[PDB]
From a paper:
The prenylated flavin (prFMN)-dependent ferulic acid decarboxylases (Fdc) catalyse reversible non-oxidative (de)carboxylation of a range of acrylic acids with extended conjugation. The final step in the pathway consists of the decarboxylation of 3-methylcrotonic acid, catalysed by an evolved ferulic acid decarboxylase (Fdc) enzyme. Herein, we report on discovery and optimization through directed evolution of Fdc decarboxylation activity with 3-methylcrotonic acid to produce isobutene. Recently, a reversible 1,3-dipolar cycloaddition mechanism was conclusively shown to underpin catalysis in Aspergillus niger Fdc (AnFdc).
TaFdcV generated by 4 rounds of evolution has 11 mutations: E25N, N31G, G305A, D351R, K377H, P402V, F404Y, T405M, T429A, V445P and Q448W. The effects of crotonic and 2-butynoic acid on TaFdcV were studied to determine whether the mutations that increase in 3-methylcrotonic acid turnover also affected activity with related compounds. Incubation of TaFdcV with 2-butynoic and crotonic acid led to the familiar split of the 380 nm prFMN peak in the UV–Vis spectrum, similar to 3-methylcrotonic acid. However, as previously observed with pentenoic and hexenoic acid, the spectrum did not recover the following desalting, suggesting that a covalent inhibitory adduct is formed. ESI–MS and co-crystallization studies confirmed that the TaFdcV 2-butynoic acid adduct stalls as Int1, while the TaFdcV crotonic acid adduct undergoes decarboxylation to stall at the Int3 species. No decarboxylation of the Int1 with 2-butynoic acid was detected, even in 1-month-old crystals.
Author numbering:
A (entry chain B), B (entry chain A): 14 to 510
The structure:
């Protein structure tokens, strides 16, 4: 099976790219695995595969760190993400996002059922399960527990049986058979939890699959619409069905080649302390746990030589910045197009720590509307900031089509020189606010409301008669003849390549 | 004379450092010299010395591009700036700014007069001067003329004869005997021009000195206090006197080892079209000239084998960001400390395009003040935005003492995660605004007023009880024992040094 359809194939693809380190020396899942992974993420190095995890018993488990973090080589920067999606390792961030959006406007390719698969090679059931005895990583020294769940897919189905949601949400070991995990509004796992609560179901059938087909974990991190099952979306991206096997102890379906599956229930009543956790914005608050829902684990099934993927998230650059903001950006672009706004492209610049999205404006179309930045910024915010796909994003930066939104430097240049502070901004005090951002939960105003802005970084004339400047840069301030004469003589004269 | 006291010694210092390319092939000062210089600045390469400029006659002139731009080696990034100031090429940005501020707390060392110097080796006088015939560079294809003046020092003296100002302001060739150049409020060349206008002088004695002592060009770019002669401040930085020679045709004094000096007058009545120009924010507006004062040149004196320095400014990274923003940040730091604010450090992050200054707060001292972000942000903006040193800066970012303000990434992380948009900002509509920024002159509100902000990127607890988080990074989320084990294993395991 190809790398995009098998986590095991994906690991072999990273090994063939020279993008993986096999660590055969013993590594402690108590901080050491996470510390190596963190330094890989901070230096854009090769993905670490921990083949010798201290305390690993009965084939549980190896750990892969930094599954979707960046490569240092500029030409292959997004290569680990491209290997999730059958793209070449030289794929741009735009190629990745265009691919994830491609299933927006084709029929779903429905999953197919198989009677067994590698995920059924081993099992532990009922009283034999002790999650406290498994080598679950301590991901940050001040975390409130061992975060087993940083890169698995939660599988949960609506009461009408029509909607099977796949999503990533963190969870830590809580007890011998229990996890505690974030189940927050407006995420689909919480929307589905509340539907079961409302009809009186105490224990909701649930599964958590680790080392899923790479296309599936990408869809799990994407805010595709309410009531759309990720399985068919994934099939449409991959151009063929995901093969699913039924769980042994409930009626849910998991990918047949998953590394590890937990089967059990999500409670609508039982709560337990969850966190703290070193989260996507780069912060942990020692001692600050909050009640979260309890997951009960009734069976574990796993592959021989099982691998648990691990995101050691925090400061730049890990899966929380390469997947969460970027895939929200892709969905915000599509919402803006839906609403008839002249947006061609969107990206979440890494410098914004997954709180910023830059929206590229088709300025020809914009001039036909005969509007102004003040009116346009308000309309963009009113569309985006009252939708789930805009929940985590606190600053939208509107830029003209001379700016590459995929280049942090271009976006920051437009922001700093085209958006007059206060004057060119529209502030949103009444929309849902992402409480995980420190300036929200640990700030000066309501933790769950407001703190958003649309920054108009189009110059005044872009709305009326058009661009009337030239960049003072090599590309735009010198004629083609002069540029070519320089580039042809560059190395001969003594400059670097 | 050492490198920091002689431009010619400084050029040889860059050559000794392997930081200089001698281009002995013919290079056209019409766009080709600037195009090479611009690509050097965009790639942080070696400074280009054009030894064979097409149209050079009688020793006028060679050109040095990118005299104070960045090196590519991260340990010597600021080495070209350090060689202006008798600092090692490994000097930090903090070392450079501390050296430039060192003269504000010690008595000036007054310049010494010499009867002659290398700048008197050659002369062109009166009717023999034809500036349109000199190899003045065309710096950007859409500029309104040949900007001869991008890295020279204007010398102008007050009516009472006691204050001699040295500053950098652009000027272009206007005619056979004239330049036109920016003389804008609140700059000292404009304050002194207005002193002369008020007593009815039409033509003010003036000189422009190119390839001055590198310490002198750094002070020329720095907003030292009103009425302080830069000569004595430069002496104090260097710890010895600048040697000055009198001009032949007026009573002004210029560095005796300058490469090239123009002697003449600055008009108080006559203006000529000036610009457009590819300016510090990265923009040229083709066809958009504005009236500026006329300089008349009556004599040229120059060294054998004279070198004209040239700044091909625009997009990152050239002299306008390495010197203008950083030296303003230095003066803003000193202003904050004189106002009694707990500011330890300040820098102008390159991503702000010399419009942002980050201010590092002593949070132990802040807590002793018992204040809050709203009150403190307003006080900082009131102190800074009502002073000349704050004029070019539109955004101040206040950060706690865990942020390295010299590191653009740490500043952006603090700004993105610790400053609630709107809520944590104080906007300034009534202060002077820097019209050259496109969102000012080409924006939605008054070109010369407002458009400023202080962003409070201190979390709420920093003002009261103290830092209550840990960064989710390698340095802060893992114990020293774990960090040491990982660092000691790193290369053996197969990761990059
Ligand atoms: C906010 C999140 C995390 C955190 O910062 O603690 C935590 C970190 C980890 C586990 C590493 C993490 C990774 C590595 C990735 C790649 C994504 C997330 C997370 N975690 C969180 C979480 O615990 N809760 C949550 O609300 N969303 C999270 N997402 C994002 C969601 O997956 C995304 O919003 C989906 O679109 C949701 O699917 P639908 O509801 O639309 O079907
Ligand atoms: C704003 C400026 C420029 C521009 O962007 O066009 C232009 C570009 C060049 C020449 C390359 C340039 C360089 C390479 C450097 C290093 C500095 C400047 C400039 N130019 C300008 C200009 O034309 N007018 C201006 O008002 N200030 C300028 N400074 C900054 C001043 O030197 C500084 O503000 C001093 O502090 C002023 O001294 P005092 O008055 O305090 O004594
Ligand atoms: K393997
Ligand atoms: K239902
Ligand atoms: K999803
Ligand atoms: K604008
Ligand atoms: K020389
Ligand atoms: K000066
Ligand atoms: K704040
Ligand atoms: Mn969903
Ligand atoms: Mn001055």
């Amino acid at each position: 099976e190809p790398p995009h359809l098998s986590f095991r194939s994906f690991v072999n693809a990273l090994r063939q790219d020279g993008d993986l380190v096999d660590i055969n020396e013993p590594v402690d899942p108590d901080l050491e695995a996470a510390a190596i992974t963190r330094l890989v993420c901070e230096t854009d190095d090769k993905a670490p595969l921990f083949n010798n995890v201290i305390g690993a018993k009965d084939g549980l488990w190896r750990i892969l760190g930094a599954p979707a973090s960046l490569r240092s080589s500029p030409k292959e920067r997004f290569g680990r993400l491209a290997r999730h999606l059958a793209l070449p390792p030289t794929a741009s961030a735009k190629d990745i996002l265009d691919k994830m959006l491609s299933a927006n406007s084709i029929p779903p390719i429905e999953p197919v059922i198989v009677p067994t698969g590698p995920v059924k090679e081993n099992s532990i059931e009922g009283e034999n399960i002790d999650l406290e005895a498994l080598p679950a990583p301590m991901v940050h020294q001040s975390d409130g527990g061992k975060y087993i769940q940083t890169y698995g897919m939660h599988v949960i189905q609506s009461p009408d049986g029509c909607w099977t949601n796949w999503s990533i949400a963190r969870a830590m070991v809580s007890g011998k058979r229990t996890l505690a995990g974030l189940v927050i509004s407006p995420q689909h796992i919480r929307k589905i939890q509340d539907q079961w609560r409302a009809i009186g179901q105490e224990e909701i059938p649930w599964a958590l699959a680790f080392g899923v087909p790479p296309t599936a974990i990408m869809a799990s991190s994407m805010p595709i619409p309410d009531g759309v099952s990720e399985a068919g979306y994934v099939g449409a991206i991959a151009g063929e069905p995901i093969k699913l096997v039924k769980c042994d102890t409930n009626n849910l379906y998991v990918p047949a080649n998953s590394e590890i599956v937990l089967e059990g229930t999500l409670s609508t009543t039982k709560m337990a302390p969850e966190g703290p956790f070193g989260e996507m914005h780069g912060y942990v608050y020692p001692g600050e746990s909050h009640p979260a829902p309890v997951y009960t684990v009734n069976k574990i099934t796993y592959r021989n030589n099982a691998i648990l993927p691990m995101s050691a998230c925090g400061r730049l650059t890990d899966e929380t910045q390469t997947m969460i903001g970027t895939l929200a950006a892709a969905e915000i672009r599509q919402l803006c197009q839906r609403a008839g706004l002249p947006i061609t492209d969107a990206f979440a610049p890494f410098v914004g720590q997954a709180t910023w999205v830059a929206l590229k404006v088709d300025t020809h179309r914009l001039r036909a509307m005969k509007t102004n930045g003040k009116a346009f910024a308000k309309r963009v915010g009113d569309v985006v900031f009252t939708q789930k796909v805009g929940y985590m994003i606190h600053r939208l930066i509107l830029v003209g089509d001379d700016i590459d939104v995929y280049d942090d430097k271009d976006v920051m240049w437009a922001f700093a020189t085209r958006c007059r502070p206060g004057t060119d901004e529209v502030f949103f005090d009444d929309v849902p606010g992402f409480w995980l951002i420190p300036y929200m939960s640990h700030g000066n105003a309501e933790a769950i409301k407001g703190g958003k802005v649309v920054s108009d970084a189009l110059l005044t004339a872009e709305y009326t008669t058009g661009k009337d400047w030239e960049s003072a840069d090599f590309k735009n301030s010198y004629p083609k003849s002069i540029q070519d004469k320089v580039l042809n003589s560059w190395e001969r004269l003594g400059f670097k390549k």
